[PDB]
Amino acid sequence: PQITLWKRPLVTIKIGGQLKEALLDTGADDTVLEEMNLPGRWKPKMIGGIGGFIKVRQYDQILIEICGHKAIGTVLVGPTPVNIIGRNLLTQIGCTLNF
Amino acid sequence: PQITLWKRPLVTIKIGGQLKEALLDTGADDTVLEEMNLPGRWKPKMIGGIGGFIKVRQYDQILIEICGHKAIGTVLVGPTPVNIIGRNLLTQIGCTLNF
Ligand SMILES: [Mg+2]
């Protein structure tokens, strides 16, 4: 798709057998989603840093369908205020900024 | 341009007679830049909210050249950790997400 930016770029994602809403966020390095069950080995990761850090669980090689397009990559799971699709997965789906 | 997202989307901007670096940030509603002198009437604005608020100065109808393309819009000036080009100005330059 081509997505304009008058509104927050919220899209439907499919992940872990669930549907969720998430923000396409070019200002975020990583993808971080609300609590949910994902397969595989995870390890804790400290993210943020500006004001403090937040602990999340890092899951690698997770399949996601972001607005119809499939990708595999790292998904952090933990207490984020908004579900964020970060650059790691935006690149995997071939999402670019254009003007 | 077409900008991929392997790296942070930092671009050169021209504003207020100066050159600066800023991030093209689809996860930010507003444009917020480090301390600098801008023309016109400003008013304080509280931004953020997640953990607390930060006070910035709101300047309207400021001309900016974002990676070669001119736009006019609102620029918030204050103590941001990164210079951010938010959706308000991304829309003005016709920046879209595409995949
Ligand atoms: Mg951000």
**Structure's resolution in angstroms:** 1.4
Q: Which helix (H) or strand (E) holds A65?
A: strand A53-66
Question: Method of determination?
Answer: X-ray
Instruction: Count residue pairs from A and B with Cβ separation < 8 A.
Output: 100
What is the C-alpha R_g of chain A?
A: 13
Q: Which two tokens stand for residue B28?
A: 């930010």
CB B33 within 8 A of CB B84: yes
Q: Which among B86, B25, B28, B34 has a CA at the least distance from the CA of B56?
A: B34
Give, in order, the Cα–Cα distances in Å from A39 to each of A14, A45, A93, B67.
15, 17, 21, 42
Q: Where are the alpha helices (DSSP H) in A29-99?
A: 87-92
Q: Which helix (H) or strand (E) holds B98?
A: strand B96-98
Give, in order, the Cα–Cα distances in Å from B19 to each of B11, B16, B28, B93.
10, 8, 21, 18
Tally Cβ neighbours within 10 Å of residue A5.
23
Can A30 be counted among the known catalytic residues?
Answer: no
Which chain A residues contact residue B9 at CB under 8 A? 26, 97
Sign, Cα dihedral of B82, B88, B89, B94? positive
CATH number for the domain spanning A20: value is 2.40.70.10
| Residue at token pair 């100065």 | B57
* Main-chain phi, psi angles of B83, to 5 degrees: -70, 125
Domains of chain A: total = 1
Range of the domain at B25: 1-99
